[PDB]
Amino acid sequence: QVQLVESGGGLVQTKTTTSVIDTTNDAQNLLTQAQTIVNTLKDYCPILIAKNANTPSWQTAGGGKNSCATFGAEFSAASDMINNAQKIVQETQQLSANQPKNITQPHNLNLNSPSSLTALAQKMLKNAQSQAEILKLANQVESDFNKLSSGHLKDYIGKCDNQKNNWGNGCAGVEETQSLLKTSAADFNNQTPQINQAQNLANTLIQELGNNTYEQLSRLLTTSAQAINQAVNNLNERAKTLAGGTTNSPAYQATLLALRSVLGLWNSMGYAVICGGYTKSPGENNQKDFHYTDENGNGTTINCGGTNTLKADKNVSLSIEQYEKIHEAYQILSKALKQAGLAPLNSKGEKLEAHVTTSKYGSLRLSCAASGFTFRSFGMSWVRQAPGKEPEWVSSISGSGSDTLYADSVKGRFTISRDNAKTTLYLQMNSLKPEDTAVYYCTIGGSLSRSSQGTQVTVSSHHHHH
Amino acid sequence: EVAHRFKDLGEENFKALVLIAFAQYLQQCPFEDHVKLVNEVTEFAKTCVQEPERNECFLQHKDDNPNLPTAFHDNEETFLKKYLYEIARRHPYFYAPELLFFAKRYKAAFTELLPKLDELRDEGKASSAKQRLKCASLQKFGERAFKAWAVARLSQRFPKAEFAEVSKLVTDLTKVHTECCHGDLLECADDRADLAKYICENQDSISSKLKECCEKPLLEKSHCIAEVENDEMPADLPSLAADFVESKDVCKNYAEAKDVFLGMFLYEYARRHPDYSVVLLLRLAKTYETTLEKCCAAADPHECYAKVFDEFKPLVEEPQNLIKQNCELFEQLGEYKFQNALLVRYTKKVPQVSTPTLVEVSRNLGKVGSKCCKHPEAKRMPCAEDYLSVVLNQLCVLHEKTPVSDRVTKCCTESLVNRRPCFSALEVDETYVPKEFNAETFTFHADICTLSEKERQIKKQTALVELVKHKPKATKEQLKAVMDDFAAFVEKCCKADDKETCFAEEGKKLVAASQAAL
């Protein structure tokens, strides 16, 4: 007599908390949000999931090894974009801090004293030096983006393509921002003759201040009189669009590229990152599901914690706290890149409310103690009843356990696993919804039932913390 | 216990039963000492009106081949008594109730030619070799093999019986055959009578054709029970696929009871196809089981064991098309020309077998066609395996004694289920060396005109075989040309006034035509 004795769990109550963060869409904040993603990825270097044309090339390649083994130069190029884009936010601060002034009185010594012309020439060249540095830094992150692309995340970042998730793709608009950065830095590099003339003109004046006062004023009154005014004019017009501009500023399109690219690499690769590593109490469940609801409503979820719990070291998974900060920084970056946008580098920034939804207690494994037959050479399966509805096959496994089949409704959450020794079939359910309420029975092949089955309860509670 | 035994079937048969009892066990002792021993036990049986290894020692004493080998009108009692005692002491395991049944035909024919004397004895020794074969098949292969065969056989015989009664009949029938293979007439024969009685009580649930057998007494009852004509199926049965492969839970019911589920498959398939050979039914069962074993361990066995009937079709195509192609060839050719064609084919594929052995094999193979090709296709394949089993087992048994070739040794030692197929599809033996030409085999003497027609056939066929062993170039143009000229030469020179001259003068003329050509 074949004996199938299902001994799983019963009542599950899955709590899920949405906590809304109030932040700002200014550049230096989003840059810190992006540093959280990248630095955590490099400094701790998590093992990738070792899963196949459908799956990415880097997946079958660097799967089962640490992340930096596959995305070393991609993490480095991403960190460079972030730190360089931070420098251009600092340098536009110094740019707007040093704004030169026009020559008011052409023929006077009361005002327009030697000290005022000295300070004005200083403001001229400090303004031009700051402008030159952020143009260099803008083309610097452009090269760092060409390095981040055309590597392992080429045909991934920059292409976008419930339902099928959009993981593995950039879907962050980096091709569009880059093209604007190209045209933006193109027009500004064309203004290089003007900024070089303003640089030298200020350097002639600092030497002309060494000349005698009345003697040099004689030739200054009569020419480098309007020349300064002209030069100072295009120098201030340049610094305005260089800081306050959006599509016109290489500094805006550079910071926007560094943020969208950090969103791109996490959209392309973050799903493979192993999380849930234990810090203490070896085996602590810590199973927290991190929800990823994109802007159009189609939400995914990543099951982090959990024979699935190992340490939380460098090159050895990540802690739930570490993934919590990655998830917060992603959701704060997703919004304000999708809704608010990037506030101009000279602007103060506007407020936005970014939700971070995460659930707990949504996991449960079942066990079927098979006996009375040759369990090792029989493909087993799980089926669930539910009230009134016909029996629904959820999953099935082969005799050796290598072949696993799952239904579309279950696909992505549950995982079948047999034990040929000790002859016990398991079904590990994760991220389970109230619509999973059903009595579960294991079966040899499928269809009907011949056992005392499992238990049928699932309840979900949601909290909106502020 | 001798009371109920003696009141059944009369007083006469118990005398001969005691006779052949020890006449089979101890064989070298004479005749008159057995007769007095018969009366010794017989009169005490009328007066009233062991341990396992003990009978195994008696079985070891059984010598299957002993060193011992008007009168009816004068005293048929002692005449048949010696005849029965002599058959018993020749074959120590021969069917004892059939021995008495053959004695009834023996005394009835004497009280009333070549078929009468030859066919009677050779049928008995052929049946004697049949239980030896079924016992040798019981061993080596096992009780499960016999179980499976019996399931397919008697479920073809009684399709109206449920699987429970068929499987029941199989279990007790295996017990009967294991006891009769142990020569234990204390356990066999009565089990044969118990099973014959049991079949007669529940005759309605098995088959109605058994009504003639239950009116017969205990002897011929179980005899004709082994001879019952098959009963007709309900002629309304569904496709067994709907309960075996088209349906689900196949791997479920297989895990519940593997052999029982496999027996349900064979019971349904055989009861639907009586026109198939029992060997074919076991071919289909072993293919279904191997398919079930492979598919049940997959993640999705339904898509796996589906299209298993595509594996069944070629296993039934190969023998069926061989039946119709050899029947139609024998139909247009006749028995003799069919035997000649059989001579060429089997000497082509394996010329290493002796020339005589190839001759009578091809002869009786033509007799196989002469017997079965008269029956319709509904009974062709069963008829074919009934004779091909004995014939193939016969040449196999003799081949183990004198190993001639390796292809036949391989085919004889493989499974009995794939013997006829493996013997078929055997290509012409490659690299066979043309035998040395010796003209003494091509000598024709006037005795062939005086020889009997049956003898004439063997003299022509033996020359045909030895001809094939020389110059293996066997394009049918040269074969037909040799047959045309030689058959005309034999008759034209037989009608000559001095055949001794005609045979020798046109012999080398046709030899120089047989040679100087290939």
Numbering used by the authors:
A (entry chain B): 1 to 51, 61 to 170, 183 to 243, 252 to 335, 348 to 507
B (entry chain A): 6 to 54, 94 to 113, 125 to 167, 178 to 583
What does the paper say about this structure?
This long half‐life is mainly related to both its large hydrodynamic diameter (~5 nm) that hinders renal filtration and its ability to bind the neonatal Fc receptor (FcRn) (Sand et al., 2014). In this context, the small and stable heavy‐chain‐only nanobody NbAlb1, capable of binding both human and murine albumin, has recently been successfully applied to improve the stability and prolong the in vivo plasma residence time of multiple small therapeutic candidates. To unveil the molecular basis of such an interaction, we solved the crystal structure of human serum albumin (hSA) in complex with NbAlb1.
The crystal structure also revealed that within the Mgb, the NbAlb1 domain adopts a bent orientation if compared to analogous fusion chimeras developed for cryo‐EM studies (Uchański et al., 2021), thus proving a certain degree of plasticity of the hinge region connecting c7HopQ and NbAlb1. We were able to easily trace the electron density of hSA residues for domain II, though it was less defined for the other two domains. In terms of the binding interaction, all three complementarity‐determining regions (CDRs) of NbAlb1 make contacts with hSA, establishing multiple noncovalent interactions with residues located at the peripheral extremity of domain II and covering a total interface surface of 560 Å2. More specifically, NbAlb1 interacts with two sides of a groove defined by α‐helix III of hSA subdomain IIB (residues 313–323), a flexible loop (358–P366), and the disulfide bond (C361–C316) that joins the two lobes of the groove. Within this surface, four main hydrogen bonds strengthen the binding of NbAlb1 to hSA. Our study was the first to examine the binding mechanism of nanobody NbAlb1, revealing that this molecule interacts with an epitope located in subdomain IIB of hSA.
